[PDB]
Symmetry: C6
Subunit: 73 residues, 6 copies
């Protein structure tokens, strides 16, 4: 029921997506977006930032920092 090795990632981002939890996404270049997850695959995260879409490549992402903790397993 998952791809081996990315259970934390897929579960976590999927919880952020379902609940639409606001999060600060720190990028590797040090820039940052404060928005919500619309969608994601293995390489990209589609983000809702103040009503505007932002397609962010995962390799550019440093950290997801949610405003509310996600329930774990």
């Amino acid at each position: 029921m998952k791809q081996g090795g990315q259970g934390l990632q897929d579960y976590y981002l999927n919880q952020l997506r379902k609940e639409k939890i606001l999060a600060t996404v720190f990028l590797t270049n040090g820039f940052q977006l404060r928005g919500r997850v619309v969608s994601f695959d293995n390489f990209t995260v589609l983000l809702d930032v103040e009503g505007k879409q932002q397609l962010v490549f995962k390799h550019a992402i440093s950290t997801f920092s949610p405003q509310k903790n996600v329930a774990l397993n």
Copy 2:
């Protein structure tokens, strides 16, 4: 069909290309490009910048920030 975990990225860039949406492409090094997606594969995105082609590697791309939102399913 041929897919894997990259439905989101492919669909999205394909929508930007087909709808000729103007997008700002923020690269990880800080540089930016305003243009349109002519084409793309798994590693590169061909952009149209004022009639001038620009071949951009996806590993160097941070975010795609479109002028208009893409209709998702």
Copy 3:
């Protein structure tokens, strides 16, 4: 029971997680977080920084620096 080639990484992070060792996580951009390891996979590490969760991509991590050494 084991993916070859990542025994050091997996064992080491699993120990910091079980032993609740406080660690400074240096990111490749010079940012750093001081917290504990809650979970991890092949790409991400979930961190506990003063009560708040921090999902960190491993490709962005530069160094784990624990407060207490891990037994090997």
Copy 4:
């Protein structure tokens, strides 16, 4: 005759190479080279900059910007 997923990249670099199009190659660290494509594989591009060879890693390349557009 074709590795799926890299048709744009391979075709495009092959055209710059055959047509000897002068191109500015932006590297991810802000460096740039102005020369022509001699050869390439899945990881490297061999460049001709004013008579001198420059073996450039593709993971370090940010953008190819040709003097003349490639026909698609």
Copy 5:
């Protein structure tokens, strides 16, 4: 035996570890560490820095600069 195209890296770090050679590890972000290789896998290198362990990801390492040369075959 288990190998692939990584004979050079494995042999070398293994020689540094077995011979307890002091090496400066330059990371891509500019930071440096003087210490010894305790252990390593395909992605990480465990270092000893003044009795303090430091888990370093190989993708963030630029160069290993040893205090003494390693005998190669």
Copy 6:
């Protein structure tokens, strides 16, 4: 007689190694080494810089700039 997709790379670095051609190796962090190739695998290049070994990860390398052009195919 090779691994598909890295013929230019393996041939080129092997020519630099056999002839011991001096080259400036530009790293992605903008630092640089002027030396000769002792060995290489798929991930690392062992470098001779003024008689001192430098194990450089390939992912940190930006450019090899030889003092003498390598004969091609």
